[PDB]
């Protein structure tokens, strides 16, 4: 009704002159936001010996009070590639480790996983045994030493290996014919694969896993959960900040 300004008639609104651009919406770009390293997960090393289990790279159903957790939960289907940074931080005395090789093995979505120490290295009496699936071969094996290491880390890029054209972040159905409470929001292979960290350190320290998601694509936006509580009616939340009145 009437539309634009200053007569005050019913339905009439005053003039507004829209602002000019400046930032160009570059920062709200989906793939820009996800192409950075995020500290998601922290994990323990397995001993060289025994029958270790692989850790699945699935950052999807998180509750973590971190920016990547909510963000990954903003869409229904997701596709992206992956980059990893694995670091190693001592939890004991750094002089406990004189060599400290760490074998990292990455497995594509669908890879077989049973391993037991099976590859023997021999030298002057004593010997060392590594896992059947830690050896360098078909899938990537990375070996880094923690001892004098200036960064006690490694890192590499890996692609989207799932069989699904897109990863369902939410799934209204079951991933298996038997409909068990377990296979509910499920679907097999809705992830990035799995890794196996193995080392004579294992005690002595842990890791720090960071994910970077290059080439991200999101489908079907979903509601974004709050993050903070609701302040009192008619008030404003007040947070500590850079700006703030001294």
């Amino acid at each position: 009704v009437t539309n634009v300004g200053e007569d005050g008639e019913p339905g009439e609104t005053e003039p507004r002159h829209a602002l000019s651009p400046v930032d160009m919406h570059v920062h709200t770009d989906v793939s820009f936001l996800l192409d950075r390293f995020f500290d998601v997960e922290t994990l323990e090393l397995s001993n060289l010996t025994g029958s270790p289990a692989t850790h699945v790279l699935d950052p999807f159903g998180s509750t973590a009070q971190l920016a990547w957790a909510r963000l990954l939960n903003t869409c229904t289907y997701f596709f992206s590639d992956l980059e990893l940074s694995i670091q190693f931080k001592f939890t004991t005395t750094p002089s406990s480790v004189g060599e400290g090789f760490v074998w990292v093995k990455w497995f594509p979505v669908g890879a077989p996983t049973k391993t037991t120490d099976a590859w023997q290295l021999e030298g002057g009496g004593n010997s060392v045994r590594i896992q059947q699936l830690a050896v360098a071969g078909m899938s990537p094996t990375v070996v880094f030493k923690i001892a004098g290491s200036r960064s006690q880390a490694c890192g590499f890029s890996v692609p989207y290996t799932s069989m699904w054209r897109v990863v369902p972040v939410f799934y209204n159905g079951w991933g298996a014919p038997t409909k068990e409470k377990a296979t509910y929001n499920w679907l097999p292979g809705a992830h990035f694969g799995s890794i196996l960290l193995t080392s004579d350190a294992h005690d002595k320290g842990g890791c720090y896993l960071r994910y970077r998601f290059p080439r991200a694509n999101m489908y079907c936006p979903r509601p974004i959960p709050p993050a903070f509580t609701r302040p009192a009616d008619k008030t404003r939340h007040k947070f500590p900040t850079n700006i703030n009145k001294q």
């Binding site: 990863v167 369902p168 799934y171 209204n172 159905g173 079951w174 509910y184 079907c220 936006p221």
Partner: protein, 200 residues
Amino acid sequence: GTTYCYSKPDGRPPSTVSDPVTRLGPTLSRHYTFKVGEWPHSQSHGHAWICPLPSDKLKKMGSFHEVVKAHHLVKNGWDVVVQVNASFAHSGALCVAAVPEYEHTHEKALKWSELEEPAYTYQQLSVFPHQLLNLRTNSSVHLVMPYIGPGPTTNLTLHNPWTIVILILSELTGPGQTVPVTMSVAPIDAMVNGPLPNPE
């Protein structure tokens, strides 16, 4: 007014089936009409009738039901019209949305039920394809949804991509009687795969 959810439906056959695909014509996948429930004065904002499509009502989808029942996979969209029967003295408003991969349902999986949505959800349900059903202006919502899912087709027994959420935003006030919520569902561009054995 018709709202298309994400896009218009297509009749393209699934990229991942090298076996014969049967296109169900309109006269085969017909249309079915249900009463969703009754909206009462006592129910409060946030309350929602959750209607995954179809899975608890597949058995009442006559023709479509018979064909789907005999095959393993199905790709298809839906044409739904949700209505409400209220007088011009009734106040209130719903938000009826079409949600892909809806979940909450505490594994009462694929059963039409009623729940209480959690605030940030009812506040933001409008972020999904939807239409508001204000009792002072209109009585219907019309949504048309394309096939959607992680793969080119699914097994409706284990997965219901689309689920219709009818949510109370403004409670029912006015004449004491309830307002019945009604819904017509018509499978669209249905394609069926791999015939199953005889039921002996």
